[PDB]
Each structure stands twice: as C-alpha cells, then as structure tokens.
C-alpha cells in the first residue's frame, strides 16, 4: 500500500519472477545480460539466492558458474544464512577445488589448528563438511614470539585448575590470568625481551598487537574491567552503542 | 578433492571452490577475472573473451566489492603495463604473459577495460537484484 | 467579478496618451516596442556615496530635501531591467510601471504627490541609472549619436 | 558532426601556451596532441629515468588531497584556499571555483566551515 | 554520476553519432575542468573511511 | 556578563547557526584545551564533535530552533542505531588492546590473540532444525525430544565453526582459556559439561570426562606448538608509562583582507 | 555562409565576438541579437563580458537551440501554432488513455501482464 521495499523483498520480488512461467525467458534475457557469474562467500548465502541461481545457471551451455566460498567459516545462522543450503549445492555440484596454502599465519600455529581439529573423524559432525590439513607458507616460516626466557609456543592452553567452578567466577580468574600475562608481555616487551621475530628482524611488542577474543558483550565488559585495573587502556572494536545515550 | 590453479581451471557448467581461512581468495578472483577478460586456459578455456560488462562479480559486503573492484582495476592496470613491456615483477603474471600469443591485441583490450572499469558489473546481492528488477520490470513486475 | 471592470479600466489605460506631444500606446508597432530590456552596467571605481550624492544634488532639482542613502564601496557590475523601450518620429522614449499606490484612492494622485513618492521611494537614482545605461546603449548601437 | 558540412567556414585562433608549470604542460601536451608517457619497452628506456619532464618540487599548480570526511575535506579546502589566497597577492575569490559531485550533501559542510571563520580568516562565499 | 537506460529504448540498441549519455557528458566535463584550470587545480577525495578506516580508492578519472 | 554572552551566542545561533555557535562557545570558554590537557577527556571531546555534527546534519533540515532541541531530545530517548549514530574510535595514534567479537573478527589479522572464554557454550531450548534429508527448515511448537536434540547438534556444529573462525585469526601465538564447566547447577556431580562444548568434543574426543580426565586429554596432545600452563592469580605492578616531551609548533597568520567589496547587484541592494 | 570558430580558450572566441560586432553594426537598433546558449550561467558571464567590453549588454536573447529551432520553424513556414502539440506530458496524458484500448492485440500482451495484474492507476502513469 505505501509502496516501499526492503532488502529482503528483492530476492522475494526476483524469486517469484523467476517462479513464474514467463520469468523463465527472463532468466534467458539474464543469459543474454551475463553468460558467467562468480559468487564469492557463498556460506552466506540464503537458499533464495541459491534457487535463482539454480533458476538461471543449472545446466545452460557456454555459462558458468563459480561458487567461491568456505563451509568451515559459516558463522551467520542468526543473520539468515544456512549450511543446509551450502549442503545442497554441494550435492548438486559435481566438481570440488581448494585451496592448499595459508598465507597469515606461522607454521605452528598452522600445525596447532590442524592437530586440534584431527584429532577424531568429522569433527564437525556433519558428512558433507570434511577439513582437510592446509599447508603454511614458505616465506613465513621464520615467525617466532619469543619471550625473556625461550621461544614461546603457538597455542597454550591455560588450564584453570580445580575441580568444579560457576560462570562468573571462571570468568573473572581467567579475566586476571589474561591480565596478568598481558601485563607480563606489556613490560618485558618495552625492555627488549619479549620480541616478533622475522627471521632476523624483530620488533617490540606493543598494547595493539595483543587481542582479546570474547563473544559476548558482558564477558567484554569483564575483560576491559580486569585489564584496566592493572593500568592497561583496552578499546572494544565491537562497540556498537549510540553516542546519544552518553 | 583436487587442488586449484587460478589458470587451469575450466569454465564450463558449475564450479565450487573451498578458500581455506587465510588463503588468497580475493587474488584468486582476481587472477579469475583477468582469465575471463584475456580468454586464456586453451582447452578450459572460454569459447569467447567477455568485456568488463558481461563478468558478473557477486559479494556480499560492500567494503569487499569495493577493495576487490580497486584491486582489479589495480591489477588491469599492472597487466596492461607488464604486457606493453614483455616483462613483469610477479610469477603469476609471468605465466599470464607467457600464455598469451599475441600482445598488441591483449594490451588494447586491456586499455578498453582500464577505460570501461567505471561500468564494471561488481555488485552486490541486493543491487544485482534491484538492477534486475528494475531492467526487466515488464516480465517481473516491479515499479 | 472584477474582470469585466479591469478591462474597461485596461482600455482605459490605453486610450490615455502619455507623451509631452499626445501620444497613445497604439501607434506603437512591434518592431519599435521593447518589453522587458535586461543590462549589465559596469564600474572599476569604488562607488563613493559621498561623491555620487553631491553629483546627483547638483543637477537634479528633486534632490532638495531627500537625506543621503549610504552604502558601500561597490565595485563590479549592476544589473537593470527597464520595463518598456520605444521609438517614435525618431525619438526614443523609456517607460516604467509602478502600480502599489496604497495610500490614494481619490483623485489626489498630482503633479506634488508624484514627486512626493519620487523623493520618498528614492527612484530618482533608477532613473538616472535608466537614462546612462540607454545613453550607453544608444551610443553602442546606433552610430552617429547625439544625446 | 562539424567537419561533414560542405559549406562551412572553418577558422582556427589558437594561442599556445608555453610550458613551464604541470597544468601548463598538461594542457600543452593535449594542445599539441602528443603523448609524454613513457611505456619502458626496453630495459635501457626502464633503468634511466631523466627521458621524461622534469617536475620542480615547489611547483604546487596540481595537488591531489587524500581527506576522511566531508566535514575534514572542506577544513582543509578552506586552510588551503587561504594559503593559495596569501600566496598570491592579486587573487580575487571571485576567480576561484569549487565544483563537487554532490551539492545537497557536501553543501552543510562547506556552509559549516566557511561560517565559522573569524573576520580576519573569513571569505565570502 | 551513473544513470541506467530504461532498458526498451531502441537508441541504446543501436547507437548513433549525435546520441548524448551521461557517463560521456562527466567525462567531457571533467576534460573541460581540466582545460579550463589555468592557474591551480585542487583535487580532493575521501580516501579512508570515517567508520571503520576502510580504503576507499578514487575515480578512474583521477 | 554570563547572560550577555549567551545572548550573544543565541544571536549568533539564530544568524549563523549551530557549529558556528559552537565553535564561538568552546573558543572563548576555552574548553577543548581543558579537555585535552585532562587525562580520558579526549574520548569525551570526540563525542561532543559528532554531536556537534549531528546537530549541524539535522539543524539544516529543520526551520525552527526548538525543532532541533526536540529532535536532540526525542534522539537521547530514541537509543536506535543508525550508521551515522554511532560512536568512533576515540584514538588512532595511541596503541590499545583491541578487543572484538568472533564474528567481527571474520577476515582480519592480529598478531597476539587471547580466548577466555572460548570453553563458555549456551544450550538452545528452541526446537527449529533442518531436515537431514530434504534440507528445509522445521519448525516444532511441540516439545518433542528430537526436534530439540536436532536443533542441539546445528548449535554444537555452529559453535565449532566459531571455535574454528576464532582459532585460525591468530598469526604468532594464541592462547586458550580451558576449564572443567559445568552448565547444570550441581556443583559436584562427578563429571562435568565440556563434552558439551565446542573445544571439549575435540579435547575429550566426544566422551563426557571429569577434570582430571580433561586434564589427561589436554596433556595427551603436547607438541612443539601446542602447550599448557595453570592458572596463576596474582599482580606486582601495573605498568610503566615512559612518557616523551612534545616539539615547539606554530600557525600562520593571514597578513591582509582576502577580498575587496566584488558584488553584482542591483537598484534594489543600492536602497 | 557558417562560420566555425575554432579556438583553444574561451577569451579569444569573446574577443572575436566583440570584433565581429564592432565590426559589422546592426542596422536595426531594437532587432535583438541572437546568442544560442545551453545554460545560465553561460549566458550570465557572457554578459558580464560583453557589458566589460562594450559598457552595456543589452536586448540580448539567450534562448535553447530547439526554441531557436521552433521559432525558425513558425516564422519560416506559416500555419503552425506557438507550442507544439507533442510534449512530453501532453503524449504522457494521451498514452494513459490510450493504452488500455490497445491492450486488446496482440502485440501489447506483455504491457497487459504488466498491467492487469493490479492496478491503481500507478503503474500505467
């Protein structure tokens, strides 16, 4: 009645144009406009989409068709995306291409996330998402953290010790550990101690390379109380408040 | 599975490509694009070059379709350098020359996409969408 | 309602003459008539008010009372558009329109009271500016002209 | 369209412009109609580089201005307006334009920062 | 500044000499700024985000 | 003398607008050096310049002057995020420990990354699944037992691609929070909830185990790479600040007017 | 006979406007003088020009090239009206009638899919 659109009521609009009898030549007429089309991130990807785009390039000649995307990164179910769909075009599709090298990380850190994640078949519980080892890169191979006393690891796993603990409790004591070992990299690391090695070349650890992943905004809260009491500023790049409820 | 070479890979009927987390996805499109655009592969190749407005690209976020459309443009542009000089700096666009027969022709089609990368078709899911409805309104209804 | 007393009155606007000799705006043909002549006047100098005033009071007999306007220093170009232009037995002649007159109802509409509203609306200064810029345009036009 | 008319009388008044500045050469090299760009297709045209023109570093005829937003982009416009305008000591304001893509949303940002101005900093606009 | 053809125009089809379309008029206009400059040119544009400090890359033109 | 010039700066509002008024008020009261020169006033100086902005955006749209403080108003009571709405980063040239979100984190690099709680996990109660066959959504109102099991194991398949997205963001060294957690409220039930988990299925195997069983899988898996250490609570010193001294720096200043009285009027502007 | 002028500037084409005119004077005075424009602020700086170079600048019309166009088309050739009877609203009112009469062919089949889905009078306006 009052005319408007949403985002979402595009791909409605387009859906059941192309549900229609006549839309078919439409699609055709989208044959005639693009004869190829490369679809990157398709882990977010609404089955819509995937049925517009297996409404215009299912089968036609001289189209085709790239699906470039990762199952192992689809973290947006709560936005509209769905790994059931990624599911269905993987069993529609008939050929399978990866990547085998990794350029952001040290080789350790490459082994560490590779053992942890084969350590049992299907780790992630479904048939259809297989992992695979990746391979690290040659040219970063020489990155080392290296603390005062020896080469530190890639991951380490603090333990907090005890038999039974609560939320709030856990998650202040491991809120002081992440403290502690910040402040610990935070004043050796301006003394020449704790050092990013390249190679040869080396470089201070500074407040900005150290990051603290949390998932929700209260245990964020927690770690910005517990890191600011030991005088270490902390900025929260999740921050989405409005500056009108200052 | 198998593994995936940017220029051997045939582009014909469907394709699904798995970038691992850190792998170069934003170069492979791009090496991609640059395949479609000069015609190369031999066998898996095209049966036709496409022009910058025929290669539809579809990302979600806009920064991405942004930072890839300047990165393309970046990269048309070092390849039509490299192609009018026989000689480049990077692997990739050492085996892109050496592909290719002739450099009078690939250099002048790369100079019409530099000067045709303002109407690059590089959009989103919801702008490819709109743009669709809004061409075809008759068959589809659209205001 | 008031239509069909305007056009008696609009007939009756041009069956007046309005000439020092009698003569009506019909005898006006299309080629001699000019509605609406848009200017550019330029100055390169600063417009002193000082220096423009005493000039004005010099030769205009109007400019006996009619304290002095101030403004400032204008240097550029000004803008003009005269109403109606036009020619007759080969003398030119300009004509403006003024049609607010608020405060007469009856036939007091004199000689007095029209240099009355001249001196208190101050349109003695565009009617100089009026004849400069058709001396100016004449003298551009037509060659062989004497004011 | 122009050169297919039989009957016209074509004349040609153009003045050359000598050129010393960048926006002097530039406009020389699309007079002339002739292409200054080096391409490099041998190694010996690659290693040296004085084959091209000599650019002077205090030449500021051509500037290009990276800025984070529309309110910062004008506050510099503005600070460089007023250096160009003290630069030269004949410069009327009236002989400088500033043409944007968008009026309507860069126009409260260019009435915000030519307003704030003090009367010794202050250009009409 | 990009405005799209209505889709069934016939003159978008089959292109003439004296046929006028916007991208060409920004481009002769941004050749005309460029000629018309005698003195100065100043060229601004955003190039970092104000949001999340993004790289945001110019025209072609420039 | 305060009520005088705050007409004058009403006069200059109702003339010359908002940042015109604003800028008048924070350079005769000097402010903006107050807020400088005060330890974590920066942050606060930067909100009021995009209020400032955002009152400027929004004055122009509005004829009236009490429309603006209404609408400065109703957007204080109106707590919506818009793009524009949002708060900026503070500082750029100072270093911080930047905290962010998994899913903000999808696609970027840091050198140093720390996860507390990445053995926290939260059960769905809800029963909406997919179908293992015909992959379309199913929606259950009905409390049935497979529909909330079937909807358990999409939410266990969704914490380990976040376990996965925020394990593979590290680049030198990343270090993990492990501990026996227990979501059922008995305190010592002889076996605890990491099974339930996305880090526990791939430390214990699947297999619900205790924390000395824990313990025996996390010290099973001990590589060059991959080590442990015990939790240590305890604090010496908080830091140092080393800070520097700033250089001398000036403006310029314009020596004359920059334009002479260059207008095309009229008749009408010359009365 | 036309006469092209071309020119690299636009000051040497004003300057050979105000040759042309001091040249070759007009023998009717109050015979306007035809300046065929595109824009305003074109015909604006080009009386400002005019009005520096010959001390006035007036009874200059500016019009568009299609009213120019037009008024040759009356002027030459008799029994043609001031306006034309094809313009862009008066074919738009003419086409919202005409329409749904020819909705019964053939050939309009797709304009009826279009439009006898829902109407409201939106979409055939």
């Given at each position: 009645?009052?005319?408007?659109?949403?985002?979402?009521?595009?791909?409605?609009?387009?859906?059941?144009?192309?549900?229609?009898?006549?839309?078919?030549?439409?699609?055709?007429?989208?044959?005639?406009?693009?004869?190829?089309?490369?679809?990157?991130?398709?882990?977010?990807?609404?089955?819509?989409?995937?049925?517009i785009?297996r409404?215009?390039?299912?089968?036609?000649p001289?189209?085709?068709?790239?699906?470039?995307?990762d199952?192992?990164?689809?973290?947006?179910?709560?936005?509209?995306?769905?790994?059931f769909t990624?599911?269905?075009?993987?069993?529609?599709?008939?050929?399978?291409?990866?990547?085998?090298?990794?350029?952001?990380?040290?080789?350790?850190?490459?082994?560490?996330?590779?053992?942890?994640?084969?350590?049992?078949?299907?780790?992630?519980?479904?048939?259809?998402?297989?992992?695979?080892?990746?391979?690290?890169?040659?040219?970063?191979?020489?990155?080392?953290?290296?603390?005062k006393?020896?080469?530190?690891?890639?991951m380490?796993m603090?333990?907090?010790?005890?038999?039974s603990?609560?939320?709030?409790?856990?998650?202040?004591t491991?809120?002081?550990?992440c403290?502690?070992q910040?402040?610990?990299?935070?004043?050796?690391?301006?003394?020449?101690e704790?050092?990013?090695?390249?190679?040869?070349?080396?470089?201070?650890?500074?407040?900005?390379?150290?990051?603290v992943?949390?998932?929700?905004?209260?245990?964020?809260?927690?770690?910005?109380?517990?890191?600011?009491?030991?005088?270490?500023?902390?900025?929260?790049?999740?921050?989405?408040?409005?500056?009108f409820?200052? | 599975?198998?593994?995936l070479?940017?220029?051997r890979?045939?582009?014909?009927?469907?394709?699904?490509?798995?970038?691992?987390?850190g792998?170069?996805?934003?170069?492979?499109?791009?090496?991609?694009?640059?395949?479609?655009?000069?015609?190369l592969?031999?066998?898996?190749?095209?049966?036709?070059?496409?022009?910058?407005?025929?290669?539809?690209?579809?990302?979600f976020?806009?920064?991405?379709?942004?930072?890839?459309?300047?990165?393309?443009?970046?990269?048309i542009?070092?390849?039509?350098?490299?192609?009018?000089?026989?000689?480049?700096?990077?692997?990739?666009?050492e085996?892109?020359?050496?592909?290719?027969?002739?450099?009078?022709?690939?250099?002048?089609?790369?100079?019409?996409?530099?000067?045709?990368?303002?109407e690059?078709?590089?959009?989103?899911?919801?702008?490819?969408?709109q743009?669709?409805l809004?061409?075809?309104?008759?068959?589809?209804?659209?205001? | 309602?008031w239509?069909?007393?305007?056009?008696?009155?609009?007939?009756?606007?041009?069956?007046?003459?309005?000439?020092?000799?009698?003569?009506?705006?019909?005898?006006?043909?299309?080629?001699?008539?000019?509605?609406?002549?848009?200017?550019?006047?330029?100055?390169?100098?600063?417009?002193?008010?000082?220096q423009?005033?005493?000039?004005?009071?010099?030769?205009?007999?109007?400019?006996?009372?009619?304290?002095?306007?101030?403004?400032?220093?204008?240097?550029?170009?000004?803008?003009g558009?005269?109403?109606?232009?036009?020619?007759?037995?080969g003398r030119y002649?300009?004509?403006?329109?003024?049609?607010?007159?608020?405060?007469?109802?009856?036939?007091?509409?004199?000689?007095q009271?029209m240099?009355?509203?001249?001196?208190?609306?101050?349109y003695?200064?565009?009617?100089?500016?009026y004849?400069?810029?058709?001396?100016?345009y004449?003298?551009?036009?037509?060659?062989?002209?004497?004011? | 369209?122009?050169?297919?008319?039989?009957?016209?009388?074509?004349?040609?008044?153009?003045?050359?412009?000598?050129?010393?500045?960048?926006?002097?050469?530039?406009?020389?090299?699309?007079?002339?109609?002739?292409?200054?760009?080096?391409?490099?297709?041998?190694?010996?045209?690659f290693?040296?580089?004085?084959?091209?023109?000599?650019?002077?570093?205090?030449?500021?005829?051509?500037?290009?201005?990276?800025?984070?937003?529309?309110?910062?982009?004008?506050?510099?416009?503005?600070?460089?307006?007023?250096?160009?305008?003290?630069?030269?000591?004949?410069?009327?304001?009236?002989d400088?334009?500033?043409?944007?893509?968008?009026?309507?949303?860069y126009?409260?940002?260019?009435?915000?920062?030519?307003?704030?101005?003090?009367?010794?900093?202050?250009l009409?606009? | 500044?990009?405005?799209?053809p209505?889709?069934?125009?016939?003159?978008s089809?089959?292109?003439?000499?004296?046929?006028?379309?916007?991208?060409?008029?920004?481009?002769?206009?941004?050749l005309?700024?460029?000629?018309?400059?005698?003195?100065?040119?100043?060229?601004?544009?955003?190039?970092?985000?104000?949001?999340?400090?993004?790289?945001?890359?110019?025209?072609?033109?420039? | 003398?305060?009520?005088?010039?705050?007409?004058?700066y009403?006069?200059?509002?109702?003339?010359r607008?908002?940042?015109?008024?604003?800028?008048?008020?924070?350079?005769?009261?000097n402010?903006?050096?107050?807020?400088?020169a005060?330890?974590?006033?920066?942050?606060?100086?930067?909100?009021?310049?995009?209020?400032?902005?955002?009152?400027?955006?929004?004055?122009?749209?509005?004829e009236?002057?009490?429309?603006?403080?209404?609408?400065?108003?109703?957007?204080?009571?109106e707590?919506?995020?818009?793009?524009?709405?949002?708060?900026?980063?503070?500082?750029?040239?100072?270093?911080?420990?930047?905290?962010?979100?998994?899913?903000?984190?999808?696609?970027?690099?840091?050198?140093?990354?720390?996860?507390?709680?990445?053995?926290?996990?939260?059960?769905?109660?809800?029963?909406?699944?997919?179908?293992?066959?015909?992959?379309?959504?199913?929606?259950d109102?009905?409390?049935?037992?497979?529909?909330?099991?079937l909807?358990?194991?999409?939410?266990l398949?969704?914490?380990?691609?976040?376990?996965?997205?925020?394990?593979?963001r590290?680049?030198?060294?990343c270090?993990?929070?492990?501990?026996p957690?227990?979501?059922?409220?008995?305190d010592?039930?002889?076996?605890?909830?990491?099974?339930?988990?996305?880090?526990?299925?791939?430390?214990?195997?699947?297999?619900?185990?205790?924390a000395?069983?824990?313990?025996?899988?996390?010290?099973?898996?001990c590589?060059?790479?991959?080590?442990?250490?015990?939790?240590?609570?305890?604090?010496?010193?908080?830091?140092?600040?080393?800070?520097?001294?700033?250089?001398?720096?000036?403006?310029?200043?314009?020596?004359?007017?920059?334009?002479?009285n260059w207008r095309?009027?009229?008749?009408?502007?010359?009365? | 006979?036309?006469?092209?002028?071309?020119?690299?500037?636009?000051?040497?084409?004003?300057?050979?406007?105000?040759?042309?005119?001091?040249?070759?004077?007009?023998?009717?005075?109050?015979?306007?003088?035809?300046?065929?424009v595109?824009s305003?602020?074109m015909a604006?700086?080009?009386?400002m020009?005019?009005?520096?170079?010959?001390?006035?600048?007036?009874?200059?019309?500016?019009?568009?090239?299609?009213?120019?166009?037009?008024?040759?088309?009356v002027?030459?050739?008799?029994?043609?009206?001031?306006?034309?009877?094809?313009?862009?609203?008066?074919?738009s009112?003419?086409?919202?009638?005409?329409?749904?009469?020819?909705?019964?062919?053939?050939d309009?089949?797709?304009?009826?899919?279009?439009?006898?889905?829902?109407?409201?009078?939106?979409?055939?306006?």
């Amino acid at each position: 009645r009052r005319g408007e659109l949403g985002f979402d009521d595009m791909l409605s609009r387009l859906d059941s144009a192309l549900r229609s009898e006549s839309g078919e030549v439409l699609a055709a007429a989208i044959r005639t406009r693009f004869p190829v089309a490369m679809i990157d991130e398709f882990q977010d990807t609404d089955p819509q989409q995937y049925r517009i785009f297996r409404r215009i390039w299912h089968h036609q000649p001289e189209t085709a068709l790239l699906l470039i995307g990762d199952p192992k990164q689809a973290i947006y179910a709560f936005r509209g995306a769905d790994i059931f769909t990624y599911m269905k075009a993987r069993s529609e599709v008939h050929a399978h291409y990866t990547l085998d090298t990794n350029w952001r990380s040290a080789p350790g850190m490459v082994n560490s996330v590779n053992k942890l994640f084969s350590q049992t078949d299907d780790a992630f519980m479904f048939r259809e998402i297989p992992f695979i080892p990746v391979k690290s890169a040659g040219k970063n191979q020489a990155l080392r953290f290296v603390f005062k006393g020896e080469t530190q690891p890639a991951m380490k796993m603090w333990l907090m010790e005890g038999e039974s603990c609560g939320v709030g409790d856990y998650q202040s004591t491991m809120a002081q550990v992440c403290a502690a070992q910040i402040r610990d990299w935070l004043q050796a690391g301006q003394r020449g101690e704790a050092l990013l090695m390249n190679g040869d070349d080396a470089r201070p650890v500074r407040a900005s390379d150290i990051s603290v992943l949390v998932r929700s905004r209260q245990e964020a809260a927690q770690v910005r109380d517990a890191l600011t009491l030991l005088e270490i500023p902390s900025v929260y790049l999740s921050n989405r408040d409005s500056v009108f409820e200052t | 599975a198998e593994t995936l070479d940017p220029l051997r890979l045939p582009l014909q009927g469907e394709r699904l490509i798995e970038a691992s987390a850190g792998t170069g996805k934003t170069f492979t499109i791009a090496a991609l694009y640059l395949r479609l655009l000069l015609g190369l592969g031999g066998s898996a190749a095209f049966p036709r070059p496409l022009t910058v407005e025929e290669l539809l690209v579809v990302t979600f976020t806009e920064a991405a379709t942004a930072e890839l459309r300047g990165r393309i443009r970046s990269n048309i542009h070092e390849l039509r350098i490299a192609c009018l000089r026989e000689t480049t700096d990077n692997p990739l666009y050492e085996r892109l020359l050496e592909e290719i027969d002739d450099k009078a022709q690939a250099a002048q089609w790369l100079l019409l996409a530099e000067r045709q990368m303002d109407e690059a078709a590089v959009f989103t899911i919801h702008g490819f969408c709109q743009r669709m409805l809004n061409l075809n309104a008759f068959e589809s209804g659209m205001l | 309602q008031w239509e069909p007393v305007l056009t008696e009155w609009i007939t009756a606007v041009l069956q007046a003459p309005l000439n020092e000799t009698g003569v009506s705006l019909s005898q006006l043909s299309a080629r001699n008539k000019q509605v609406e002549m848009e200017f550019y006047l330029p100055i390169s100098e600063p417009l002193i008010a000082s220096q423009l005033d005493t000039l004005i009071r010099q030769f205009d007999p109007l400019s006996a009372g009619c304290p002095p306007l101030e403004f400032m220093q204008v240097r550029g170009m000004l803008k003009g558009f005269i109403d109606l232009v036009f020619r007759h037995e080969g003398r030119y002649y300009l004509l403006a329109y003024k049609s607010n007159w608020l405060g007469e109802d009856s036939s007091a509409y004199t000689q007095q009271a029209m240099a009355a509203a001249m001196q208190a609306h101050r349109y003695d200064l565009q009617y100089q500016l009026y004849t400069l810029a058709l001396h100016r345009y004449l003298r551009h036009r037509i060659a062989d002209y004497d004011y | 369209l122009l050169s297919d008319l039989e009957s016209s009388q074509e004349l040609d008044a153009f003045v050359d412009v000598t050129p010393d500045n960048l926006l002097h050469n530039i406009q020389s090299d699309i007079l002339e109609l002739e292409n200054r760009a080096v391409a490099g297709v041998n190694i010996e045209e690659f290693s040296r580089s004085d084959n091209k023109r000599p650019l002077d570093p205090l030449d500021s005829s051509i500037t290009f201005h990276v800025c984070h937003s529309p309110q910062r982009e004008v506050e510099v416009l503005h600070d460089r307006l007023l250096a160009m305008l003290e630069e030269d000591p004949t410069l009327t304001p009236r002989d400088i334009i500033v043409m944007v893509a968008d009026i309507d949303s860069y126009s409260p940002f260019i009435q915000a920062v030519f307003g704030s101005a003090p009367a010794d900093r202050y250009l009409p606009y | 500044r990009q405005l799209a053809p209505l889709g069934f125009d016939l003159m978008s089809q089959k292109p003439k000499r004296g046929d006028r379309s916007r991208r060409d008029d920004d481009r002769y206009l941004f050749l005309e700024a460029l000629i018309s400059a005698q003195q100065k040119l100043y060229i601004s544009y955003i190039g970092r985000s104000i949001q999340d400090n993004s790289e945001r890359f110019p025209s072609v033109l420039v | 003398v305060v009520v005088e010039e705050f007409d004058g700066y009403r006069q200059i509002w109702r003339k010359r607008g908002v940042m015109p008024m604003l800028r008048a008020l924070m350079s005769a009261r000097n402010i903006a050096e107050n807020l400088l020169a005060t330890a974590g006033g920066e942050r606060r100086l930067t909100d009021i310049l995009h209020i400032s902005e955002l009152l400027q955006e929004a004055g122009t749209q509005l004829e009236s002057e009490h429309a603006l403080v209404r609408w400065l108003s109703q957007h204080i009571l109106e707590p919506d995020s818009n793009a524009s709405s949002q708060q900026m980063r503070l500082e750029s040239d100072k270093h911080l420990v930047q905290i962010v979100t998994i899913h903000k984190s999808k696609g970027l690099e840091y050198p140093l990354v720390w996860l507390p709680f990445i053995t926290n996990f939260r059960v769905q109660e809800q029963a909406f699944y997919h179908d293992r066959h015909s992959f379309e959504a199913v929606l259950d109102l009905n409390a049935a037992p497979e529909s909330v099991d079937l909807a358990e194991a999409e939410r266990l398949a969704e914490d380990l691609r976040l376990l996965y997205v925020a394990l593979t963001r590290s680049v030198w060294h990343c270090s993990l929070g492990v501990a026996p957690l227990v979501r059922r409220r008995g305190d010592k039930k002889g076996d605890t909830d990491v099974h339930q988990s996305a880090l526990g299925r791939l430390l214990q195997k699947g297999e619900p185990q205790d924390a000395a069983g824990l313990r025996t899988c996390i010290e099973a898996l001990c590589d060059d790479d991959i080590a442990w250490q015990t939790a240590q609570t305890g604090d010496n010193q908080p830091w140092q600040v080393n800070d520097v001294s700033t250089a001398e720096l000036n403006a310029k200043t314009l020596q004359r007017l920059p334009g002479d009285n260059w207008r095309v009027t009229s008749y009408s502007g010359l009365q | 006979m036309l006469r092209v002028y071309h020119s690299n500037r636009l000051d040497v084409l004003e300057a050979l406007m105000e040759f042309i005119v001091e040249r070759e004077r007009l023998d009717d005075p109050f015979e306007p003088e035809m300046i065929l424009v595109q824009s305003t602020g074109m015909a604006q700086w080009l009386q400002m020009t005019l009005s520096q170079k010959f001390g006035i600048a007036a009874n200059i019309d500016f019009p568009l090239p299609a009213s120019f166009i037009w008024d040759m088309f009356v002027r030459v050739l008799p029994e043609i009206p001031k306006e034309s009877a094809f313009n862009k609203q008066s074919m738009s009112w003419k086409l919202m009638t005409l329409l749904p009469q020819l909705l019964e062919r053939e050939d309009f089949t797709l304009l009826r899919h279009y439009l006898t889905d829902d109407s409201d009078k939106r979409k055939l306006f």
